Design a protein around this motif. Structure first.
Motif, PDB file in Angstrom:
ATOM      1  N   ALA A 199      -5.435   2.116  -3.614  1.00  0.00           N
ATOM      2  CA  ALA A 199      -4.416   0.553  -2.864  1.00  0.00           C
ATOM      3  C   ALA A 199      -5.203   0.656  -1.271  1.00  0.00           C
ATOM      4  O   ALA A 199      -5.426  -0.598  -1.005  1.00  0.00           O
ATOM      5  N   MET A 200      -6.301   2.078  -0.903  1.00  0.00           N
ATOM      6  CA  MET A 200      -6.469   1.712   0.261  1.00  0.00           C
ATOM      7  C   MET A 200      -7.888   1.808   0.652  1.00  0.00           C
ATOM      8  O   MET A 200      -8.741   1.281   1.412  1.00  0.00           O
ATOM      9  N   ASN A 201      -8.591   0.981  -0.848  1.00  0.00           N
ATOM     10  CA  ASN A 201     -10.473   1.309  -1.288  1.00  0.00           C
ATOM     11  C   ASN A 201      -9.790  -0.633  -1.332  1.00  0.00           C
ATOM     12  O   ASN A 201     -11.025  -1.813  -1.500  1.00  0.00           O
ATOM     13  N   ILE A 214       2.310   9.070   7.398  1.00  0.00           N
ATOM     14  CA  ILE A 214       3.133   8.351   8.168  1.00  0.00           C
ATOM     15  C   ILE A 214       4.296   9.329   8.896  1.00  0.00           C
ATOM     16  O   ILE A 214       4.884   8.114   8.043  1.00  0.00           O
ATOM     17  N   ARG A 215       4.495  10.072   9.835  1.00  0.00           N
ATOM     18  CA  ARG A 215       5.946  10.639  10.134  1.00  0.00           C
ATOM     19  C   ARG A 215       5.783   9.483  11.697  1.00  0.00           C
ATOM     20  O   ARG A 215       5.155   8.529  11.853  1.00  0.00           O
ATOM     21  N   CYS A 216       7.288   9.997  11.417  1.00  0.00           N
ATOM     22  CA  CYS A 216       7.813   8.706  12.634  1.00  0.00           C
ATOM     23  C   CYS A 216       9.088   9.373  13.554  1.00  0.00           C
ATOM     24  O   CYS A 216       9.784   9.066  12.606  1.00  0.00           O
ATOM     25  N   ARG A 217       9.815   8.758  14.683  1.00  0.00           N
ATOM     26  CA  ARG A 217      11.224   8.977  14.996  1.00  0.00           C
ATOM     27  C   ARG A 217      11.810   7.789  16.133  1.00  0.00           C
ATOM     28  O   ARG A 217      10.414   6.763  16.477  1.00  0.00           O
ATOM     29  N   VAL A 218      12.412   7.042  16.188  1.00  0.00           N
ATOM     30  CA  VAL A 218      13.573   6.119  17.498  1.00  0.00           C
ATOM     31  C   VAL A 218      12.671   7.125  18.672  1.00  0.00           C
ATOM     32  O   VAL A 218      12.911   8.060  18.912  1.00  0.00           O
ATOM     33  N   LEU A 272      11.002  10.095   9.252  1.00  0.00           N
ATOM     34  CA  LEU A 272      11.066   8.516   7.709  1.00  0.00           C
ATOM     35  C   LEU A 272       9.474   8.509   7.444  1.00  0.00           C
ATOM     36  O   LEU A 272       8.560   8.616   8.490  1.00  0.00           O
ATOM     37  N   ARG A 273       9.276   9.266   6.142  1.00  0.00           N
ATOM     38  CA  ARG A 273       7.652   9.512   5.644  1.00  0.00           C
ATOM     39  C   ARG A 273       7.405   8.103   5.158  1.00  0.00           C
ATOM     40  O   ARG A 273       8.073   7.636   4.158  1.00  0.00           O
ATOM     41  N   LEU A 274       5.831   8.176   4.934  1.00  0.00           N
ATOM     42  CA  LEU A 274       6.132   7.154   4.004  1.00  0.00           C
ATOM     43  C   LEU A 274       4.129   7.621   2.948  1.00  0.00           C
ATOM     44  O   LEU A 274       3.145   8.388   4.192  1.00  0.00           O
ATOM     45  N   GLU A 275       3.894   7.238   2.079  1.00  0.00           N
ATOM     46  CA  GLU A 275       3.310   7.803   0.992  1.00  0.00           C
ATOM     47  C   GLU A 275       2.197   6.792   0.970  1.00  0.00           C
ATOM     48  O   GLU A 275       2.863   6.022  -0.299  1.00  0.00           O
ATOM     49  N   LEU A 276       1.147   6.395   1.272  1.00  0.00           N
ATOM     50  CA  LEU A 276       0.531   5.684   1.319  1.00  0.00           C
ATOM     51  C   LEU A 276      -0.452   5.891  -0.550  1.00  0.00           C
ATOM     52  O   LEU A 276      -0.437   6.917  -0.528  1.00  0.00           O
ATOM     53  N   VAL A 281       0.522  -0.661   0.171  1.00  0.00           N
ATOM     54  CA  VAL A 281       0.369   0.211  -0.206  1.00  0.00           C
ATOM     55  C   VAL A 281       0.760   1.318  -0.112  1.00  0.00           C
ATOM     56  O   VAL A 281       0.437   2.638  -0.211  1.00  0.00           O
ATOM     57  N   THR A 282       1.989   0.860  -0.336  1.00  0.00           N
ATOM     58  CA  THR A 282       3.160   2.083   0.055  1.00  0.00           C
ATOM     59  C   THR A 282       3.969   2.733  -1.264  1.00  0.00           C
ATOM     60  O   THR A 282       4.057   1.736  -1.800  1.00  0.00           O
ATOM     61  N   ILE A 283       2.967   3.867  -1.190  1.00  0.00           N
ATOM     62  CA  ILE A 283       3.937   4.631  -3.362  1.00  0.00           C
ATOM     63  C   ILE A 283       5.632   4.759  -2.833  1.00  0.00           C
ATOM     64  O   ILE A 283       5.703   4.904  -3.622  1.00  0.00           O
ATOM     65  N   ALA A 284       5.883   5.481  -1.675  1.00  0.00           N
ATOM     66  CA  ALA A 284       7.228   5.766  -1.959  1.00  0.00           C
ATOM     67  C   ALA A 284       6.819   5.879  -0.262  1.00  0.00           C
ATOM     68  O   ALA A 284       6.433   6.368   1.154  1.00  0.00           O
ATOM     69  N   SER A 285       8.445   5.844   0.357  1.00  0.00           N
ATOM     70  CA  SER A 285       9.200   5.834   1.781  1.00  0.00           C
ATOM     71  C   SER A 285      10.621   6.997   1.580  1.00  0.00           C
ATOM     72  O   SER A 285      11.661   7.072   0.634  1.00  0.00           O
ATOM     73  N   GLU A 286      10.686   7.905   2.421  1.00  0.00           N
ATOM     74  CA  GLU A 286      12.001   8.638   2.144  1.00  0.00           C
ATOM     75  C   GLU A 286      11.723   8.802   3.649  1.00  0.00           C
ATOM     76  O   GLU A 286      11.633   8.899   4.732  1.00  0.00           O
ATOM     77  N   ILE A 287      13.283   9.523   3.955  1.00  0.00           N
ATOM     78  CA  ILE A 287      13.821   9.802   5.118  1.00  0.00           C
ATOM     79  C   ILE A 287      14.558  11.145   5.310  1.00  0.00           C
ATOM     80  O   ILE A 287      15.611  11.277   5.428  1.00  0.00           O
ATOM     81  N   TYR A 288      13.386  12.382   5.884  1.00  0.00           N
ATOM     82  CA  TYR A 288      14.239  13.401   5.628  1.00  0.00           C
ATOM     83  C   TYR A 288      14.641  13.912   6.876  1.00  0.00           C
ATOM     84  O   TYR A 288      14.619  12.834   8.089  1.00  0.00           O
TER      85      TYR A 288
END
Ligand code: MG
Ligand code: ZN
Ligand code: ZN
Lengths: 134, 1417, 49, 8, 107, 277
Positions: free
Chosen positions: B1174-1176, B1211-1215, B1166-1170, B1129-1136
């Motif tokens: 694909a979610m439907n 979806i953003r996130c950190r450790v 770390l960002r994810l662009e779903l 379901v993830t179109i791309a992922s990046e780490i800014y």
DNA sequence: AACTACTTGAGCT
RNA sequence: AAGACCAGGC
DNA sequence: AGCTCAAGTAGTTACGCCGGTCAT
């Protein structure tokens, strides 16, 4: 004419339809040894050994060959060769048991090793028969 | 056999004992000291030096000489000699065990490495199985390497007790070429274990220990796996082939014996002279080798060991390897005498069972007929006749075991025979002989025929006996064998006669019908329009040999007296033959002249073709066989033939281009059905080249494009042909040849008069071999049909280059497998065989093998012979509860529901009887028990099944045997009927035993029949339907009983080989292709292999009881099973880089922060662009998605997310020492080890609307389709306990699984179902019993024993047996190793021995009763 | 087929030469960015600039 | 089959 | 009959065959959610007194080994709690006779 | 009417049969099954069109399946036990700095994807920073020298095995590592193994070639023995006469001797049933 | 040519 | 006389 | 030193029946 089998008009089979000649060539040599011991092309009989064939050798002129006119058959020895060792073991060639026909051309010849090379050719006319494939 | 009587008693081998030669024995047996390595030449003088071959062994040159045990060459089996090796050697094939033995025993001492003391050892020590013991053992002792002298007793590990001693550490051994070496342990210490050393240790190994490991103190002791004195085999073994006299010529083995001999000599001459002790070993390894060679010359450590010239040098074991090699090459099959073969061509004037043999051949093949005062006269004639007159003979053999050659012997025409002499005569008319055509994959690939000597060089066989051998006359050849004993013949005529074969047990239907001309014409001759006049109606009756000599009254007299085919064709049908049909619009006055009705053996109505006279079920043949017998029916062919063939000879018939041309306008109407069809493609291509179409769940946008193009062209093509089909009149010859059912079908006409079709390979229309195009003659990216291989033209018109080519590429694929599946199919066949050989019904009715192991307690679960079985319809089961009752219900206590006194003869005197209405209850109450019991066996409702004794006909025979009127009443007490059918059931005995368990089996394996029985013998039917008199009834009954008893299987029936073929046969007729789920050929393969990873695993699960046609309920489960991962379901992922946990460096994110602080971390993002769409699809929620994520990592990863409303899901996130490395490993752990919805291994999951027959409340079965979920992967234990499914119907084709989850039983059920669906997916039909037997054999030993070298060929079966398939030699090695004993109960053993095998005919003994041999006179 | 024939074996250089003298700047000295969409040329499987 | 259709 | 939820320790269960005559069994939870016998394909099995067994053998002239077997760790074998030496009569529907009676001894 | 084209050994008419084969000196890229430490790989079979003709191929692998974090690129060289990570192969060649390496592989600084891929690879070789060490790690002074060899006579031996062309081979190994990725990024399909254009047909003429050499070469080192005995004519011109005959007679190209490891079929017995035959 | 068996290797406590 | 290879047949 | 788990590497066996040419 059922199941891929066909009917062929005998009458025209007679007028020569689909008839074909068949040739064959049995061939032999006269092997030697650096140690002067040579073979032979003759019309052998008896002579201490026995090593001979069942058929006939009579259609063999004294040169150990047949003539091109001869009508050979059954097993009739086509060629006559011998091997002196220690005194006559046969190496004569017989017309293949299933065959027969007529001699069509005999020929004598040299070999690089000055040996006696001889090939024989037999002819036969083969007529279409109740089984042959087309 | 042998020549020259031997005083020694004659016996047959009843047992075979394997073992290994103890050196002392070889010595004992040897008659030659064998020291010299040459042959003979006493210094050129020819003889045989006392050195090698014949230093007393067998002999050459026609010289009785052979140690005076004379016999000369033939009669003298070989004589073994020996040869004392200089030093002990390894037996090339045991080197494996020799090693595993040491791995299990200690050195310097020589005793086990685990005593009763070690527990896990006790167990191993109790495993009773000479092989699995030595198996389990080694799996233990290969670890411990300390010859422990003390270990804790069976009390407290506190104290220690002692046993054998000297704990010298045991080395770890490894294989390097032909030497075993090991290390003892800082850093090891390497030494090369000598042979002399090993052997010594073995010798010491304890006797109860030999036995602990897989050995036998008497026949094969561990030590003998090393050779001391080598057994030298004699001449007949390694014959010499001289070139006349003065020329060498020695066998292969007669060399590596000498190579060995020489490698022995030199060795010793280094151990009795300046022995440089470390330069000898360098010469020992050589002997070890040459001896490895001699026996085996195909090993690991390459060094092929070639003979001067490059020649490999056949090792003894090479002479044995299966196929070509002794076992499979010379024993399981040999060239035999009394045989002939030539070209076949059918003859329409030969009784079904004859076989025309060319005079030539009959004058060649003879038959030893002993002189007897019944045939002396004829024989003395045949003998005078000589070997050159046909009805003559060619050899006379006097009592004095000597032979006279009738073509030479000076007393040729002399000879007067002597009773007791035997004469070899020319085969004559009516000599039973085995005729066959291989591939021989049928019981019918070989059949006994009546001999008919005829002229011309060819075997002339009947047409109807064509399909069994499966021959044609385009050059095909046939093998013929000639029986030789008086019984041999009988055995050939009483079981293999062609007439006995008419009903094939594999598909319980005949297997020979009326082909080509006879069929095609029989059709014409039948039509109402077909009439024949006297002149011919006479010459036609004449051709029927059995003709009663009575011309039947003309079907017309008025102006011209004519007859109709239907009439005359009928003169061929015997009296009592009753046949009924019903096609489409068929009814007792068949308008279109359909159906078929033959009464009293006269065709009443309908046309006759494939359906009525083919190798089919209802088959008039199938019926005439059953009703009249092998004989009568066998004759029936020739007649139906002779009449028809003759008729056709005069009516003529042909075919020509004209039969393939379509109407003037039809050829147009079609063209534009391709044009329009072309645009319905151009249309969906435009609508695809615009993204204006949605993806049908589970398919790719592209794939779904094809899926339509294909379904468009196909439907186009389908009617293209159909226009012409109906455009070809009832005169079109091609049509005629299709209706008759004698050749071709719709498809054919189509491709010849309309459209050829779409071409294809690997399932998809002609690929793009050329980058983006079909041919260089095309524009790139052309997805149209004219490019992908659609031949729009008809054969009558002609293909265009392009069309012509594709077409070739298409056919090319075809030819391919017809040239591949051809022998791989044969392998799969072969296996099935070598896997059931020894299975045969036993005198108690048990189906067992060469071990008595019961594979089936009652063959086929009923003990019936498939031949005597037909498709019957169990009434009771189908129909409404309403219509049921109105049929079998009888109520003597009721004005409306009682037998009208116009049916019975006591109808009024019976009305109201209470005692009778009770026997009538027992009955009606029964039938109901049935009805419900059959819906418990056949949940399908299908009431048609194969069942012995055809009751429908059996009654139809009564019908006219006593001529019953549908008017005047019967004469049966109600007790007469009901009571009578009970007495019957009592005599339908299959098993016979005195006790109960048996008597139970009786009732058990019967039941189903009884129900069919009641169904047609209910009082109501028996009186109201088929007015049976008292007489009739007593007859029908008596017959059902009799018939049945014949329909039972015969003990002897070599059942296994039967089912084996019965199964493999209908496989040779399939395609290797899995096109047009993995099925067919490769599938069967897949199965027989018991594959652990099938190509298509997949698994079908049905909803739970309730919710059935609940569309949305389907989905609601789909998404609860179909494994969905974050990765999908993830179109791309990046780490800014965002160091501020209260705002972003990103725009389209701002909001998403502030709106997430009302109702420590790392600065690395770390960002994810779903995907939205694909979610439907797999349906998902940010709330869920994340929820999952969060709880995956938990308290050491803060995560956030937007809301489903936005135009960008995120979806953003950190450790929470180098973080850019960590926050990247957690990049993957997120995309490949995290699931959202589903059960692993379960990808794609489609939905389907299936056809499920089912019980309406009102009784009748009706259409109630229900949704079902099919998977694309396989896990059970888990997808079973899911809320919403029916863990009582779930099903994966992976039988492997099913067995593991539901118990071997349920497993079997699958294995069968899967095999069945593989045969049935091809239209072919096989009878249960077959597949079952296979299924059962694989299953019984406890699990899933595969039909492979790693299965059946690995059980406790005989050794000689398994040895005749795959591992031939080692199978013997490890058989003499553990000293196996072979019963010689296996079919194979006996063939290998040359004794009559316990097979049907030999499954018993024949003894003369002296007692009765006195009362007869 | 009837029209098909097989190659036989010509010489490379009379074409390698014929090239690096008609626009073929040799591989030896190459610069990927100055020459962006530079159409690379192969000779019998070798890259000659 | 091969030379008629897919399915065939 | 202990019903371990996720799993028992290798140290633990290594104490089962330590209290004879009595015998103990172990069943995972997630494996008893659905009674397996309930399945369509699963035919009815049945135990046999050392009487009903010593009968089958005499009645068919069997040498025990000649009898179709069933695995100790067989799903159904466990369910009815068999043991090495016990027999089981299987009774299933048959499209040929109606009901067939097979037997499996437990190795 | 006899169009000829056949040989006449010891009497019978022998016809050399064309032998199809996968052409040489060309770049191919193959995807390698889900079960394998390798994702994709590119190969190129190389052999001197004229001169000895070595049969050693180049393997430019691509470890790390379509997932795992370690998607590196390593290649196989002739005579080297293990495999080497492309970076080193470059520095060992004559290109020591990064980006100058990416210079050869990728031809478009604005193709971050590809470049990205390369990244992890660069890290692999980050430990060897020059031509000294470059040619080293390939297993002192004794080892370094051999390193060179396998690059001037074994490495992509076509192109030329001269010396001062290191540069050229480098652009190839670059054009190769490129072709690899060009696919692992779904831009170019896996090479069509049966695209007839890339298959060659060794007719009669050629066959005698590879055959003759095998012969004349045994004559070559034969004439070497007569010259190695004369402590002060010999050329047995029968090895080229009888050698040729054997093959053409039977159908076993490769010599005779304890070498049946040849191919039978080449050269048969010309049909004479019919003309069209 | 493909699998499956058998034994071995490297990672891991 | 045995083997190997090619060819061809259903 | 010692143990479970995964992978490698080794090795095996396959196909129905039926003239020419060459050489140890
Ligand atoms: Mg045929
Ligand atoms: Zn003897
Ligand atoms: Zn010891």
């Amino acid at each position: 004419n059922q199941e891929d089998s066909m009917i062929m008009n005998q009458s025209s089979i007679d007028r020569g339809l689909f008839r074909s000649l068949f040739f064959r060539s049995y061939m032999d040599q006269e092997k030697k040894y650096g140690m002067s011991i040579t073979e032979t092309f003759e019309k052998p009989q008896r002579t201490n050994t026995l090593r001979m064939k069942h058929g006939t050798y009579d259609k063999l002129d004294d040169d150990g060959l047949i003539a091109p006119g001869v009508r050979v058959s059954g097993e009739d020895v086509i060629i006559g060769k011998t091997t002196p060792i220690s005194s006559k073991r046969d190496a004569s060639t017989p017309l293949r048991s299933t065959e027969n026909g007529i001699v069509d051309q005999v020929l004598v010849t040299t070999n690089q090793d000055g040996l006696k090379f001889v090939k024989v050719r037999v002819r036969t006319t083969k007529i279409p028969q109740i089984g042959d494939k087309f | 056999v042998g020549q020259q009587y031997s005083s020694a008693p004659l016996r047959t081998v009843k047992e075979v004992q394997f073992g290994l030669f103890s050196p002392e024995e070889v010595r004992a047996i040897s008659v030659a000291k064998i020291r010299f390595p040459e042959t003979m030449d006493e210094t050129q003088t020819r003889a045989k030096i006392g050195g090698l071959n014949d230093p007393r062994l067998g002999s050459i040159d026609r010289n009785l000489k052979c140690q005076t045990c004379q016999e000369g060459m033939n009669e003298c089996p070989g004589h073994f000699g020996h040869i004392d090796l200089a030093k002990p050697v390894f037996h090339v094939g045991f080197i494996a065990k020799i090693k595993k033995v040491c791995e299990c025993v200690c050195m310097h001492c020589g005793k086990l490495l685990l005593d009763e003391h070690n527990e896990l050892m006790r167990q191993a020590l109790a495993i009773k199985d000479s092989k699995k013991r030595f198996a389990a053992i080694w799996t233990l002792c290969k670890t411990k390497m300390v010859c422990e002298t003390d270990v804790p007793s069976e009390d407290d590990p506190t104290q220690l007790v002692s046993r054998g001693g000297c704990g010298n550490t045991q080395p770890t051994i490894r294989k390097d070429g032909l030497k075993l070496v090991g290390s003892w342990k800082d850093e090891p210490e390497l030494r090369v274990l000598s042979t002399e050393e090993i052997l010594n240790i073995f010798k010491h190994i304890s006797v109860k220990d030999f036995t602990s490991l897989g050995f036998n103190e008497v026949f094969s002791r561990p030590e003998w796996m090393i050779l001391t004195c080598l057994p030298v085999p004699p001449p007949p073994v390694r014959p010499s082939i001289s070139f006349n006299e003065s020329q060498r010529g020695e066998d292969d083995l007669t060399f590596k014996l000498a190579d060995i001999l020489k490698a022995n000599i030199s060795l010793e001459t280094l151990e009795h002279n300046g022995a440089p002790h470390h330069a000898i070993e360098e010469a020992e390894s050589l002997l070890q080798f040459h001896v490895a060679t001699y026996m085996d010359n195909d090993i690991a450590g390459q060094p092929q060991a070639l003979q001067k010239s490059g020649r490999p040098v056949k090792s003894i074991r090479a002479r044995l390897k299966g196929k070509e090699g002794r076992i499979r090459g010379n024993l399981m099959g040999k060239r035999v005498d009394f045989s002939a073969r030539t070209v076949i061509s059918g003859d329409p004037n030969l009784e079904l069972d004859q076989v025309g043999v060319p005079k030539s051949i009959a004058k060649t093949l003879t038959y030893p007929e002993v002189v007897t005062p019944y045939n002396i006269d004829r024989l003395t004639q045949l003998v005078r006749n000589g070997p050159n007159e046909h009805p003559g003979a060619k050899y006379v053999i006097r009592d004095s075991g000597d032979r006279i050659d009738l073509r030479y012997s000076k007393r040729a025409g002399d000879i007067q025979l002597q009773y007791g002499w035997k004469v070899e005569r020319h085969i004559m008319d009516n000599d039973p002989v085995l005729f066959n055509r291989q591939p021989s994959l049928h019981k019918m690939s070989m059949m006994a025929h009546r001999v008919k000597v005829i002229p011309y060089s060819t075997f002339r066989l009947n047409l109807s006996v064509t399909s069994p051998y499966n021959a044609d006359f385009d050059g095909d050849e046939m093998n013929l064998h000639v029986p030789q004993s008086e019984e041999t013949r009988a055995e050939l005529s009483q079981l293999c006669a062609v007439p006995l074969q008419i009903v094939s047990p594999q598909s319980n239907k005949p297997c020979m019908g009326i082909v080509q001309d006879t069929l095609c014409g029989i059709r014409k001759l039948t039509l109402r329009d077909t009439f024949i006049e006297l002149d011919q109606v006479l010459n036609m009756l004449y051709w029927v040999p059995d003709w009663d000599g009575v011309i039947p009254t003309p079907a017309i007299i008025k102006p011209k007296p004519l007859w109709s085919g239907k009439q005359i064709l009928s003169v061929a049908i015997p009296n009592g033959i009753h046949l009924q049909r019903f096609d489409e619009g068929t009814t007792l006055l068949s308008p279109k002249d359909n159906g078929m009705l033959i009464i009293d053996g006269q065709i009443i109505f309908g046309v006759v073709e494939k359906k009525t006279v083919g190798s089919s079920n209802g088959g008039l043949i199938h019926v005439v066989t059953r009703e009249k017998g092998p004989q009568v029916c066998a004759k029936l062919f020739g007649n139906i033939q002779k009449v028809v063939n003759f008729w056709l000879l005069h009516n003529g018939f042909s075919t020509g281009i004209g039969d393939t041309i379509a109407d003037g306008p039809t050829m147009r109407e079609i063209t534009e059905t391709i044009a329009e069809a072309k645009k319905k493609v151009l249309d969906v291509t435009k609508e695809a080249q615009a993204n204006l179409l949605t993806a049908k769940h589970g398919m790719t946008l592209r794939e779904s494009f094809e899926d339509n193009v294909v379904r468009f062209l196909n439907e186009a093509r389908d009617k293209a042909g159909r226009l012409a089909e109906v455009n070809l009149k009832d005169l079109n010859n091609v049509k005629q040849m299709v209706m008759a059912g004698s050749k071709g079908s719709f498809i054919n006409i189509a491709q010849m008069s309309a459209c050829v079709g779409q071409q294809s390979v690997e399932g998809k229309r002609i690929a793009f071999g050329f980058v983006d195009r079909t041919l260089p003659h095309f524009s790139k990216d052309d997805y149209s049909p004219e490019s992908k291989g659609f031949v729009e033209n008809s054969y009558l018109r002609g293909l265009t280059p392009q069309e012509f080519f594709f077409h070739a590429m298409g056919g090319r694929e075809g030819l391919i497998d017809t040239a591949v599946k051809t022998a791989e199919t044969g392998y799969i066949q072969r296996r099935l065989v070598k896997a059931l050989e020894d299975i045969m019904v036993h005198y108690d009715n048990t189906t067992r093998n060469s071990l008595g192991n019961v594979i089936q307690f009652i063959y086929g679960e009923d003990g019936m012979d498939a031949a005597h079985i037909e498709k019957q319809s169990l009434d009771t089961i189908g129909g409404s509860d309403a219509a049921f009752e109105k049929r079998y219900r009888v109520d003597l206590l009721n004005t409306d529901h009682t037998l009208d006194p116009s049916l019975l003869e006591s109808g009024s005197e019976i009305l109201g009887d209470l005692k009778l209405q009770v026997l009538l209850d027992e009955e009606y109450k029964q039938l109901v028990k049935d009805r419900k019991f059959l819906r418990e066996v056949f949940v399908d409702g299908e009431a048609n099944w194969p069942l012995p004794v055809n009751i429908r006909r059996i009654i139809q025979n009564a019908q006219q045997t006593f001529h019953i009127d549908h008017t005047k009443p019967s004469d049966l007490t109600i007790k007469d009927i009901v009571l009578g059918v009970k007495d019957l059931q009592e005599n339908l005995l299959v098993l016979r035993g005195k006790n109960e368990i048996i008597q139970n089996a009786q009732r058990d394996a019967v039941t189903l029949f009884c129900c069919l029985l009641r169904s047609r013998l209910a009082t109501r039917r028996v009186l109201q339907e088929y007015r049976l008199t008292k007489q009739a009834f007593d007859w029908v009954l008596s017959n059902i009983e009799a018939q049945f008893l014949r329909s039972v299987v015969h003990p002897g029936e070599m059942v296994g080989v039967l089912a084996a073929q019965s199964i493999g046969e209908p496989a040779t007729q399939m395609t290797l292709n899995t096109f047009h789920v993995t099925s067919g050929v490769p599938r069967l393969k897949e199965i027989l292999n018991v594959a652990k990873n099938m190509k298509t695993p997949s698994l079908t699960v049905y909803l739970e009881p309730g919710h059935a046609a609940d569309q949305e309920q389907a989905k609601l489960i789909r998404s609860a099973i179909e494994h969905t991962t974050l990765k999908s379901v993830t179109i791309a992922s990046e780490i800014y880089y965002d160091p501020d946990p209260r705002s972003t460096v990103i725009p389209e994110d701002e909001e998403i922060i502030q709106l997430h602080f009302s109702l420590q971390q790392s600065p690395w993002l770390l960002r994810l662009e779903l995907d939205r769409a694909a979610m439907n699809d797999k349906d998902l929620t940010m709330g869920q998605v994340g929820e999952r994520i969060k709880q995956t990592f938990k308290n050491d990863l803060f995560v956030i997310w937007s809301e489903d409303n936005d135009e960008k899901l995120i979806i953003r996130c950190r450790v929470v020492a180098e973080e850019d490395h960590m926050l990247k490993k957690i990049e993957n752990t997120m995309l490949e080890n995290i699931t959202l919805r589903g059960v692993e291994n379960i990808e794609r999951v489609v939905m389907m609307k299936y056809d499920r027959k089912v019980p309406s409340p009102t009784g009748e079965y009706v259409k109630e389709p229900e949704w079902v979920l099919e998977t694309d992967g396989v896990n059970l234990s888990e997808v079973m306990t899911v809320p919403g499914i029916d863990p009582t119907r779930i099903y994966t084709n992976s039988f492997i699984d099913i067995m593991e989850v539901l118990g071997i039983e349920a497993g079997r059920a699958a294995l069968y179902k899967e095999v069945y669906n593989v045969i049935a997916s091809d239209g072919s039909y096989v009878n249960y019993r077959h597949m079952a037997l296979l299924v059962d054999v694989m299953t019984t030993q406890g699990g899933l024993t595969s039909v492979t070298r790693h299965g059946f060929n690995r059980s406790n079966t005989g050794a000689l047996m398994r040895c005749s398939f795959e591992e031939t030699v080692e199978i013997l090695f490890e058989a003499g190793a553990s000293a196996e004993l072979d019963d010689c109960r296996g079919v194979s053993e006996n063939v290998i021995l040359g004794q009559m095998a316990p097979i049907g005919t030999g499954a018993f003994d024949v003894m003369i009763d002296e007692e009765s041999l006195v009362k007869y006179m | 087929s009837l029209m098909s024939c097989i190659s036989v074996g010509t010489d490379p250089m009379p074409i390698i030469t014929f090239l690096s003298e008609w626009g073929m700047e040799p591989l030896e000295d190459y610069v990927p960015h100055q020459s962006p969409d530079a159409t690379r040329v192969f000779v019998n499987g070798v890259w000659h600039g | 089959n091969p030379i008629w259709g897919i399915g065939c | 009959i202990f019903v371990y939820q996720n799993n028992i320790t290798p140290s633990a269960m290594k104490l089962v065959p330590s209290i004879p005559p009595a015998t103990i069994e172990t069943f995972n939870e997630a494996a008893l959610v659905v009674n397996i016998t309930h399945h369509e394909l699963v035919p009815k099995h049945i135990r046999l007194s050392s009487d009903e067994k010593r009968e089958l053998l005499k009645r068919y002239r069997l040498k025990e080994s000649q009898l179709p077997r069933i695995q100790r760790a067989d799903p159904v074998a466990l369910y009815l709690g068999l043991k090495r030496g016990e027999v089981v009569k299987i009774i299933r529907k048959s499209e040929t006779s109606g009901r067939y009676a097979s037997y499996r001894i437990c190795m | 009417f006899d169009m000829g084209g056949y040989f006449i050994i010891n009497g019978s008419e022998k016809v050399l049969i064309a032998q199809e084969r996968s052409a040489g000196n060309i770049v191919q890229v193959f995807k390698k099954a889900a079960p394998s430490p390798i994702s994709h790989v590119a190969e190129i079979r190389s052999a001197l069109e004229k001169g000895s003709r070595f049969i050693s191929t180049l393997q430019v692998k691509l470890y790390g399946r379509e997932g795992s974090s370690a998607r590196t690129i390593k290649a196989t060289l002739p005579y080297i036990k293990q495999d080497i990570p492309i970076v080193i192969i470059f520095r060992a060649l004559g290109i020591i700095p990064d980006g100058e390496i990416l210079e050869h592989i990728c031809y478009d600084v604005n193709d971050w994807q590809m470049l990205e891929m390369l990244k992890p690879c660069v890290e692999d070789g980050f430990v060897i920073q020059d031509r000294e060490t470059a040619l080293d790690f390939i297993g002192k002074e004794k080892r370094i020298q051999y390193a060179k060899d396998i690059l001037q006579k074994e490495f992509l031996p076509h192109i030329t095995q001269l010396e001062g062309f290191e540069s050229r081979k480098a652009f190839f190994l670059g054009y190769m590592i490129n072709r690899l990725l060009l696919c692992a990024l779904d831009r170019k399909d896996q090479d069509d193994r049966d695209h007839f254009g890339k298959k060659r047909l060794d007719l009669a003429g050629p066959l005698l070639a590879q055959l003759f050499k095998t012969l004349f070469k045994k004559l070559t080192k034969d004439i070497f023995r007569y010259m190695q005995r004369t402590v002060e004519l010999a050329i047995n011109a029968k090895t080229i006469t009888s050698g040729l005959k054997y093959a053409l007679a039977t159908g076993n190209w490769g010599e005779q001797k304890k070498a049946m490891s040849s191919r039978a079929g080449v050269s048969q017995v010309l049909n004479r049933y019919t003309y069209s035959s």
